[PDB]
Design a protein around this ligand. Structure first.
Ligand SMILES: Nc1nc2c(ncn2[C@@H]2O[C@H](COP(=O)(O)OP(=O)(O)NP(=O)(O)O)[C@@H](O)[C@H]2O)c(=O)[nH]1
Ligand SMILES: [Mg+2]
Lengths: 167, 56
């Protein structure tokens, strides 16, 4: 069993790497040819943080459309959210404030949000400076981290942090 | 291909635009169905959506 069951949702533009963050965290798997997520799904992983065993229930869906019939149920009971953008695509970062609004409109007031800049491996193609996003996150009271689902950097740290920050 | 006249490739372009509109409409219908079905699954038996899937 577990000391805690925490529902966490992944959100962010289509293509930013939400599903691969999920697969990397839960199974240490990455898929270069992954397609846009159809429907809604979740995967679970139990982890030891702060001497407690947390069963993380991580939900996933495509970010092609901000609001759908499933959006309320998707956010319902969620205590954590990874808000993900692609460091190599500035447009996905510009849309972060729009996703933040979707949270504010459909999720619990006390949901813990972690801004995630994914695809840090694409160093040569960076379009979003770290300092820029970190400043935005600070201003908005969000934790911030850069990850790479591809090379695994900070993937566990991101999930560990948010799970930690829910207690 | 290059056996068609200018007028004939124009009509084909028209025909394929009509068609692609119909396919987009169909995709939206499928997406809507999926989302509406999932609302019910999520509210009733969310374990169905787990990966890997474990039957109850
Ligand atoms: N270089 C690099 N590519 C990545 C990384 N994470 C994901 N990708 C790639 O980016 C593409 C989209 O990934 P995916 O996880 O499917 O994105 P998504 O956010 O789930 N898309 P959707 O919202 O539409 O389901 C894939 O080709 C995937 O392999 C990463 O850290 N680095
Ligand atoms: Mg996906």
């Amino acid at each position: 069993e577990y000391d805690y069951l925490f529902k966490v949702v992944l959100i962010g533009d289509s293509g930013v790497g939400k599903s691969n963050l999920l697969s990397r965290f839960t199974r240490n798997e990455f898929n270069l040819e992954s397609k846009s997520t159809i429907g809604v799904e979740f995967a679970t992983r139990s982890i030891q943080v702060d001497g407690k065993t947390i069963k993380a229930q991580i939900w996933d869906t495509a970010g092609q459309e901000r609001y759908r019939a499933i959006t309320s149920a998707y956010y319902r009971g969620a205590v954590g959210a990874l808000l993900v953008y692609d460091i190599a695509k500035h447009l996905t970062y510009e849309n972060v404030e729009r996703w933040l609004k979707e949270l504010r409109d459909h999720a619990d007031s006390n949901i813990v949000i972690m801004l995630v800049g994914n695809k840090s491996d694409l160093r040569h193609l960076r379009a979003v400076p770290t300092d820029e996003a970190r400043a935005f996150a600070e201003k908005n009271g969000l934790s911030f981290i850069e990850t790479s689902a591809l090379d695994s950097t900070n993937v566990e740290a991101a999930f560990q942090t948010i799970l930690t920050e829910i207690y | 291909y290059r056996s068609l006249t200018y007028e004939e490739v124009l009509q084909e372009l028209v025909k394929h635009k009509e068609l692609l509109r119909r396919k987009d409409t169909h995709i939206r219908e499928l997406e809507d169905y999926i989302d509406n079905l999932l609302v019910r699954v999520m509210e009733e038996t969310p374990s169905i959506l787990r990966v890997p899937y474990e039957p109850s």
